[PDB]
Amino acid sequence: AKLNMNNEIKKVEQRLEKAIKSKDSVLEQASLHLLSSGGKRVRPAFVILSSQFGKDEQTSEQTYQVAVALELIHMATLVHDDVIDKSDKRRGKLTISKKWDQTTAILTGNFLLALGLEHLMAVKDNRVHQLISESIVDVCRGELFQFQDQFNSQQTIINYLRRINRKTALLIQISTEVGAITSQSDKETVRKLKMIGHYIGMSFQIIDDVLDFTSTEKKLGKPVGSDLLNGHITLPILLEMRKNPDFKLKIEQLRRDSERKEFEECIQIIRKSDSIDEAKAVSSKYLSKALNLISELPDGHPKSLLLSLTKKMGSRNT
């Protein structure tokens, strides 16, 4: 009866496998292709965990259903995301748009998203739905300001944070908030988990951006500087700008049609920099803000699992 995460994730994964079956064959193969090439299922994880501080002595079906919904919405995002970025590989295999075609991927994304809505109707509180829906809207308008920001060397840090909040933190925040609201937790514990999740999410994304310069063409399943090659000016790059007026002008002149060597030069400068570490540092401060609040929660196995999971999240590198 001691909650086992591994075991919990499989129950959500099996519920995802059924949910993906379709009257249309290709949509089924595409969804399964993506589902099985596999990712870390963090969102479903935070939902299960976030519900142990409520009033259910065991995880209810209602919470497994929100977990299934969250991963399906996440997936819809990934699929449409690879169509927009002309991306090549996702989770180590071909993105849908490349294994089939562009029409298919767009359709699969709609499919995945519709299923997510079907599955959220297992929640009964009409305020959660209003909460989850307005959040998805912010996510999307976020994704738009980011595409619209592409190669803008004049953007500010306070503005990069607002961008990773809508883009990534927001759905981790919903995973922890709703997960508690499903097992009837109280104002405080929920407010507590809403905040814990939001901080993990901010740290989460900051880490991705750092790992885009420090990782490997192989472990990243993509170049490196990848985000810069697409014009995304992330935390590491904003930091090196404020303290390096040469690099700042070097970034002001940067755009898609620039020669691969001006890029190489840029991504090569960020690495021997302190900025990769100042960035990592912000991730860390963010993680402590989360660990502090996790402590203020009741002792037990759940609190031990969240503490454990929140500690890998940061001490990660892939």
Binding site: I158, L161, V282
Partner: peptide
């Protein structure tokens, strides 16, 4: 704590949209 700052500018703009 620069994060002291920021996380509340966001907070405010989430109310006074």
């Amino acid at each position: 704590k620069h994060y002291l700052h920021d996380i509340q500018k966001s907070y405010l703009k989430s109310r006074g949209n």
